[PDB]
């Protein structure tokens, strides 16, 4: 599994209705989550644990000290198959390394459940899987973290 | 080198000093969050620029993944992001030792920006404020997030 984690002051998620807002968070994280074809539940578990526990906020005096849970902040989890974009061949990407959309959705849904189980069910916002999304992100820093579980 | 590329309808970059001040802004195009590694070479930088400018990340009529940022006269906002070399394998406090140290990172970054302008056009390349806190309002389009690590390349 691949995840891009961005530290945000807020994120507003819209779909085409011109656009209607379905999701919104204030301070916290937007997590762009790529699901590999070979991902197991242990790959999911690692990403979840890292997203929830990574110490990405300062606590004056201390840098990199508080996580999303510590500060009662929110997470928006967005599925991003493009994170397996093969950009090595030419300039046209292909995405064959990403999990096929049906088994990806189920896996994703299980991840959201576990996010809610490990943190709080009110603090976990989502997009519309598969659908086109407009997301206004207020990047705080910016702070961008990347994790690939196949490096673990 | 590491880069996170996001397809945008717009991005608005502010810095400190009502309390925030807008310094850069693009419409359609890419925000590229760029991480510079300790041992990055000009060849790593060249690969990043080539891909950012030439990756076909936009639709065109009946065709998907067909047009690149240059094809559409779109813009690039290039932001230095050392946090991309944040090691998180050992505990939950990130370790950034593998990121090129600031002074060397800044000159390498500015060289990269110069080459972007040379390979595309000056007026289409936007930047932030290196080593400074930034507030970046990004309108993600899709979203479409691309990740490239040049170490994976030979
Ligand atoms: N894992 C995936 N999840 C969602 N969409 C995908 C995925 N893989 C490919 N796509 C989309 O489907 C289209 C066709 O891909 P596919 O039929 O899998 O292979 P190919 O491009 O070689 O025919 C692409 O334009 C891409 O946007």
Curated annotation (Swiss-Prot), chain A:
Top-level EC class as recorded in UniProt: hydrolase
Any Gene Ontology biological process: tRNA metabolic process
Listed result of changing residue 141 to A: Loss of deacylation of D-tyrosyl-tRNA(Tyr)
Catalytic activity, as annotated: glycyl-tRNA(Ala) + H2O = tRNA(Ala) + glycine + H(+); a D-aminoacyl-tRNA + H2O = a tRNA + a D-alpha-amino acid + H(+); D-tyrosyl-tRNA(Tyr) + H2O = D-tyrosine + tRNA(Tyr)
Database matches in InterPro entries: Daa-tRNA_deacyls_DTD, DTD-like_sf
Places the protein is found: Cytoplasm
Enzyme active site: 82
UniProt entry keywords in alphabetical sequence: Cytoplasm, Hydrolase, Nucleotide-binding, RNA-binding, tRNA-binding
Effect of mutating residue 129 to A: Loss of deacylation of D-tyrosyl-tRNA(Tyr), loss of deacylation of glycyl-tRNA(Gly)
Residues bound to tRNA: 64, 81
Chain location of the short sequence motif Gly-cisPro motif, allows the protein to recognize chirality of D-amino acids per the record: 141-142
Cellular component annotations (GO), alphabetically ordered: cytoplasm
Annotated EC: 3.1.1.96
Other observations noted: In the crystal structures with bound ADP (PDB 3KO4, 3KO5), the adenosine moiety is thought to represent the authentic C-terminal adenosine of charged tRNA and is annotated as such in this entry.
UniProt family annotation: Belongs to the DTD family.
Domain notes: A Gly-cisPro motif from one monomer fits into the active site of the other monomer to allow specific chiral rejection of L-amino acids.
Subunit and partners: Homodimer.
Role this protein plays: D-aminoacyl-tRNA deacylase, with no observable activity on tRNAs charged with their cognate L-amino acid. Probably acts by rejecting L-amino acids from its binding site rather than specific recognition of D-amino acids. Catalyzes the hydrolysis of D-tyrosyl-tRNA(Tyr), has no activity on correctly charged L-tyrosyl-tRNA(Tyr). Hydrolyzes correctly charged, achiral, glycyl-tRNA(Gly). Deacylates mischarged D.melanogaster and E.coli glycyl-tRNA(Ala). Probably acts via tRNA-based rather than protein-based catalysis.
Record protein name field: D-aminoacyl-tRNA deacylase
Originating organism: Plasmodium falciparum (isolate 3D7)
Gene name tied to this protein: DTD
